Write a protein that binds this ligand. Structure first.
Ligand SMILES: O=C(Nc1c(Cl)cncc1Cl)c1ccc(OC(F)F)c(OCC2CC2)c1
Ligand SMILES: [Mg+2]
Ligand SMILES: [Zn+2]
Length: 327
């Protein structure tokens, strides 16, 4: 009936579940490579989601382990650690003061569930790669948001495995709403949707409205914020403590170079940033931050001002670090 010493240390690390910069890689080691399962379980208990939606605990664990098992261990970035990270980051974003009591339980569930499934069964190669190779996935999804469409399909499909339907007790109305929201969120993680998403986020900041919390009248405005929330979580690596950010950069570059190597092998053109022979890891991170991450997080910071200042400060500090690294 006693915890193991490894479990106790895990439980201790998990006390930082509400904090930006949780040691997510340590949780991966301590949990025996089950970071997604343990972080989801904590978050669900913390937010009382098991009682609210009447999810049996064993069904939730079974679904979680199954979901985690369909992230590929041999993929350096897009794996169960990334998933766990986006879930936990989204969880922190949800608790921001400017969003207190804004979202319903079902919406919270949609944002967390969508974060958990958002890259499931990622093969470690891009949409374009899949399209240019005439992959089956590209054929099934008509070359449109191939991976993201696949992530959703697998995420819902896994509910049908043995004792895995964690939404068995929701009404049809609840399930239809959950589903639509989760599809909207995950399909918005395609980077080809980035500019639209940001444009709409800016439009929302300019027309912003409070009562001392944010006001959101319509589905359109509510889902837009949730889409941007999870997309911010997906692009949150450079806003984390440098120790963590540096590990994420190693891993994304490893994944990119592998795709690059496979692309060279096959005489294909080598996708941006995927040539290990002509890479600028530091320059690219700076470009990434100035053109994508900073404009998004700044706009997010404004929406929730002042709540996101420390996050923005770290992003800016990490940007100077990578800047000073440039040969
Ligand atoms: O693509 C990303 N994310 C991603 C998302 Cl959010 C959605 N869809 C696809 C991808 Cl690859 C992504 C995530 C992390 C990165 O670096 C660091 F933070 F680890 C990174 O660097 C760019 C690289 C060219 C300089 C890119
Ligand atoms: Mg993705
Ligand atoms: Zn992702």
């Amino acid at each position: 009936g006693v915890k193991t010493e490894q479990e106790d240390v895990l439980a201790k690390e998990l006390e930082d579940v509400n904090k930006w910069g949780l040691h997510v890689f340590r949780i991966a080691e301590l949990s025996g490579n089950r970071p997604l399962t343990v972080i989801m379980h904590t978050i669900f208990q913390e937010r009382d989601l098991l009682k609210t939606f009447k999810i049996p605990v064993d069904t939730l664990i079974t679904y979680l382990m199954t979901l985690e098992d369909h992230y590929h261990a041999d993929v350096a970035y897009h794996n169960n650690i990334h998933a766990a990270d986006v879930v936990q980051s989204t969880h922190v974003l949800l608790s921001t003061p400017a969003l207190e009591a804004v979202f319903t339980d079902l919406e919270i569930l949609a944002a967390i569930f969508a974060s958990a499934i958002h890259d499931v069964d990622h093969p470690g190669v891009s949409n374009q790669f899949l399209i240019n190779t005439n992959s089956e996935l590209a054929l099934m999804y008509n070359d449109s948001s191939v991976l993201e469409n696949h992530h959703l399909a697998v995420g819902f499909k896994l509910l049908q495995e043995e004792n895995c339907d964690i939404f068995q007790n929701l009404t049809k109305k609840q399930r239809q709403s959950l589903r639509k929201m989760v599809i909207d969120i995950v399909l918005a993680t395609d980077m080809s949707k980035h500019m639209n998403l940001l444009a709409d986020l800016k439009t929302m900041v300019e027309t912003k409205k409070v009562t001392g919390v944010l006001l959101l009248d319509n589905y359109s405005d509510r889902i837009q914020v949730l889409q941007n929330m999870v997309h911010c979580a997906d692009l949150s690596n450079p806003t984390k403590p440098l120790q963590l950010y540096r590990q994420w950069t190693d891993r994304i570059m490893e994944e990119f170079f592998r795709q690059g190597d496979r692309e060279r092998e096959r005489g294909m053109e080598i996708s941006p940033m995927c040539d290990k022979h002509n890479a600028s890891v530091e320059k690219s991170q700076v470009g990434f931050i100035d053109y994508i991450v900073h404009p998004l997080w700044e706009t997010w910071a404004d929406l929730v001002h002042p709540d996101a200042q420390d996050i923005l400060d770290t992003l800016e500090d990490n940007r100077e670090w990578y800047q000073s690294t440039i040969p």
